[PDB]
């Protein structure tokens, strides 16, 4: 499985220390949020598959021209591939506003540049959050609420690239403690929901969520498009339901689950746990600083067998 690697803290390890920890624990996937040169160099011949986000601040620059995208590929990708196994490139992460207007042309522009560079194995996609999907209940009722997402699904369909989704049962649960049980949320026996539309049964909030993305994809006209869960995790402190036991239970649960897929698609699901270390400098809710599997000093936040 993979682990997202965030560096928004003032007390984290060196990139090479990081890569080493990964190889020790047997983690075979990494997501990085910008073209981090030190991470990339450290990653050479490490055998770790990678999701490379371009960085939202780069979206407009890349969307402008193919020469802009070629220059980015030349500096940030060409020097590391194929030694570094970059599997995907996320042209934007949870972009909002008029910026969404830039995601399709940046996606095209990168596809053209990778092509001419002779790097067509690398696939181009975009990272979204679940709040992109409406009428998620029953999961079969899922539909993309924004118009631009259909444009994207179609491009992914024709290019053979998957969709990267940030799925967090924690946020769903946190918002709706009354309607949602901790068991259902953390992969524990107890609850069963039946999708009337297709008759599938659901025992976990995770499955129900992923299958809602699949519902939406199909409606968009992109049935064969796969989903890569580009983020999923549970905080160990800073708010409601945040605790090591809950965080241990969710993540281990997650690791032991994804290999069986979901009721709509029983194939193993590619998933990235958020995140490797707690980022002591994040803003927003107190929980943001407590999503790590490890403590800044490389010590296990709680025990997880990968």
Active site residue 218: no
CA neighbours closer than 13 Å in the CB half-sphere of residue 170: 26
- CA–CA gap between residue 32 and residue 138 (Å, rounded): 33
Concatenated DSSP letters of 153-176? HHHHHHHT--EEEE--HHHHHHH-
**Domains delineated in the chain:** 1-306 (3.20.20.80)
Active site residue 279: no
Q: What are phi and psi of 232, to 5 degrees?
A: -165, 135
- Inter-residue contact 150 to 221 (CB < 8 Å): yes
- CA–CA gap between residue 305 and residue 37 (Å, rounded): 29
- CA–CA gap between residue 177 and residue 15 (Å, rounded): 39
- CA–CA gap between residue 157 and residue 152 (Å, rounded): 8
Active-site residue, selected from the candidate residues 132, 231, 270, 288:
231
CA neighbours closer than 13 Å in the CB half-sphere of residue 53: 21
Tokens 């939202």 belong to: 56
Question: Cα separations (Å) of 7 from 56, 132, 158, 237, 253?
Answer: 16, 26, 34, 19, 25
- CA–CA gap between residue 59 and residue 215 (Å, rounded): 28
- CA–CA gap between residue 165 and residue 150 (Å, rounded): 15
Report the candidate in 8, 9, 54, 51 with the shortest Cα–Cα distance to residue 30: 51
- Pairing relation of β-strands 201-202 and 163-166? unpaired
Cα end-to-end distance, the chain, whole Å? 7
CA angle, 187 then 302 then 11, to 5°: 125
Resolution at which this structure was determined, Å: 2.3
CA angle, 110 then 113 then 116, to 5°: 150
- Inter-residue contact 125 to 159 (CB < 8 Å): no
Length of the chain: 306
> Helix 66-76 and helix 100-116: axis angle, to 10°?
60
10 Å CB burial of residue 47 (0-12, 13-18, 19+) is exposed
- Inter-residue contact 209 to 271 (CB < 8 Å): no
With H, G, I as helix, E, B as strand and everything else as coil, classify residue 4: strand
> DSSP label at 79?
T
Return the number of other C-beta atoms located less than 10 Å from residue 228's C-beta: 23
With H, G, I as helix, E, B as strand and everything else as coil, classify residue 300: strand
Residues 6+ positions from 98 with CB-CB distance below 8 Å: none
């Amino acid at each position: 499985i993979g682990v997202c690697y965030g560096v928004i803290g003032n007390n984290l390890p060196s990139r090479s220390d990081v890569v080493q920890l990964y190889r020790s624990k047997g983690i075979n996937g990494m997501r990085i949020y910008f073209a981090d040169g030190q991470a990339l160099s450290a990653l050479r011949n490490s055998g770790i598959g990678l999701i490379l986000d371009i960085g939202n601040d780069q979206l407009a620059n890349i969307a402008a021209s193919t020469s802009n995208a070629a220059s980015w590929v030349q500096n940030n990708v060409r020097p590391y591939y194929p030694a570094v196994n970059i599997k995907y490139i996320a042209a934007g992460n949870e972009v909002q506003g008029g910026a969404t207007q830039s995601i399709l042309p940046a996606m095209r522009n990168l596809n053209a540049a990778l092509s001419a560079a002779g790097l067509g194995a690398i696939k181009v996609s975009t990272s979204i959050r679940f709040d992109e999907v409406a009428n998620s209940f029953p999961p079969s009722a899922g539909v993309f609420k924004n118009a631009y997402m259909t444009d994207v699904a179609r491009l992914l369909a024709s290019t053979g690239a998957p969709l990267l989704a940030n799925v967090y049962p924690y946020f769903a649960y946190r918002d709706n403690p009354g309607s949602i049980s901790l068991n259902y949320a953390t992969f524990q026996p107890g609850t069963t929901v039946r999708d009337q539309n297709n008759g599938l049964t659901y025992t976990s909030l995770f499955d129900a969520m992923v299958d809602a993305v699949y519902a939406a994809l199909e409606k968009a006209g992109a049935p064969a498009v796969k989903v890569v869960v580009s983020e999923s995790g549970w905080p160990s402190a800073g708010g409601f339901a945040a605790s090591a036991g809950n965080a241990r239970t969710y993540n281990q649960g997650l690791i032991n689950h994804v290999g069986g897929g979901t009721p709509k698609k029983r194939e193993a699901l590619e998933t990235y746990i958020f995140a490797m270390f707690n980022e002591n400098q994040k803003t927003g809710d107190a929980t943001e600083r407590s999503f790590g599997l490890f403590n800044p000093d490389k010590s296990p936040a709680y025990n997880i067998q990968f």
